[PDB]
Amino acid sequence: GPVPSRARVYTDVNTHRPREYWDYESHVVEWGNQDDYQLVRKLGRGKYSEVFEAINITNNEKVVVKILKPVKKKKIKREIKILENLRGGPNIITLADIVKDPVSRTPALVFEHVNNTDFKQLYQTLTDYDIRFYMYEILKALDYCHSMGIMHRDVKPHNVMIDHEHRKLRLIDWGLAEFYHPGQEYNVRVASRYFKGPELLVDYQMYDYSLDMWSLGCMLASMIFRKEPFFHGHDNYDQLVRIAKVLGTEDLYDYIDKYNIELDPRFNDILGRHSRKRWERFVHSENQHLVSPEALDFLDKLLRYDHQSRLTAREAMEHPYFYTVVKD
């Protein structure tokens, strides 16, 4: 059978918390006044929610209203409990209220509004200094939620809201987030394809916070190399092949051998043999202003097959890549 794995940090945070903290199925939702919020414009629709810009008529302030699609009350209470546990943390989106929508007959989560810069304009215009700054702001949110016993499991550009005018960042959409419990096996059908960690792609279920650090590495690679997404697989199988053409197949075998994992035999015809590449190969005249030795070493230390070998969020904040970022 597979070899078990534990997070190397924050391993026991939920065991020493009171049970109420992580036993989300027992959570009693405190409902606000649904008439306090008037929907203004539809912002988006996802797999699990519709998102609206609204006005809170008790203060005439903008808010975001996320009307959940019908799913299991467990998944709904999970997201609510996580949002309440993390409220006030650095760069965590703030849950302001929870109301019962009378049309959907589901909960509507009400959040602080972030006046977000569209991700196209952001991606094409962020400078080297901007990228280090906002990576550090994401790391603050990830170290916070990890320190609080929670992994996000859906880190990707669309879930990082940036108000570039105020240099304000918020990590959003906690609907896939989970509590980390040592030894627990989790669903591997989390994250968007391009940001799925190797552990998910080889069906290793006993993963942890380090999954978020692979996703963060994928974002960093796309930003400094100006290729979005960086690992651009056609499906979940081709996704692992794309990764192995960069990190090499020998270290992939070392990884699955360490955890006594077996690859899906359908990889036999598609995986091939691939050397590990040096990150400099991805540097060219149109991205070199975004690349430094520090950037490449930091990236190299996030994108490891072995989830146990990646930088933790706190270790990442110690990296020389952030030495030039002004600290407050």
Burial class of 155 by CB neighbour count within 10 A (0 to 12, 13 to 18, 19+): buried
Shortest distance, position 24 Cβ to ligand TO6, whole Å: 16
In whole angstroms, the minimum distance from the beta carbon of 37 to ligand TO6 comes to 14
Strand order in the sheet with 49-56: 37-45, 49-56, 61-68, 107-112, 95-100
By CB under 6 A, is residue 214 in contact with ligand TO6?
no
Quick note: the x/- pattern for ligand TO6 over 63-82, rule CB under 6 A, is: -x-x----------------
CB of 20 to ligand TO6, least distance (A): 22
Tallying the residues shown for the chain, one arrives at 328
CA–centroid distance for 271 within its chain: 27
Q: Which residues of 192-230 are buried (b: 16+ CB within 10 A; e: fewer)?
A: bbbbbbbbbbbebebbbbbbbbbbbbbbbbbbbbbebbb
Kind plus residue range of the DSSP H or E element containing 129: helix 128-147
Q: Is 301 annotated among the ligand-binding residues?
A: no
By C-beta, is 37 or 174 nearer to ligand TO6?
A: 174
Site string for ligand TO6, 146-185 (x = CB under 6 A): ---------------x----------xxx-----------
Q: Which residues contact 73 (CB under 8 A, 6 or more apart)?
A: none
Residues 86-105 that bind ligand TO6 (CB under 6 A): 93
Using the rule CB under 6 A, is 304 a contact of ligand TO6? no
Per CB under 6 A, the segment of 45-53, 179-187, 237-245, 273-281 that binds ligand TO6 is: 45-53
Among 5, 56, 85, 116, binds ligand TO6 (CB under 6 A): 116
Gapped junctions in the chain, after residues (C–N > 2.5 Å): none
Q: How far is it between the farthest Cα atoms of the chain? A: 62
CB 61, min distance to ligand TO6, A: 12
- The yes or no reply on residue 51 touching ligand TO6 (CB under 6 A) is yes
Tell me which DSSP letter residue 10 carries. S
Nearer to ligand TO6, 144 or 231 (CB): 144
Q: Is residue 169 helix, strand or coil?
A: strand
Kindly list the distances between the CA atom of residue 193 and the CA atoms of 150, 179, 215, 240, in Å, as whole numbers in the listed order.
21, 22, 10, 10
> Exactly one of 6, 12, 42, 46 binds ligand TO6 (CB under 6 A); which one?
46
Nearer to ligand TO6, 22 or 174 (CB): 174
Residue 89 and residue 249: Cα distance in Å, rounded?
39
From the candidates 35, 101, 143, 154, which is the catalytic residue?
A: 154
Q: Does 56 bind ligand TO6 (CB under 6 A)?
A: no
35 catalytic? Reply is no
Decide if residue 261 touches ligand TO6 (CB under 6 A): no
Q: Which residues are catalytic?
A: 154
Binding site for ligand TO6 (CB under 6 A): 43-44, 46, 49, 51, 64, 66, 93, 111, 113-116, 161, 172-174
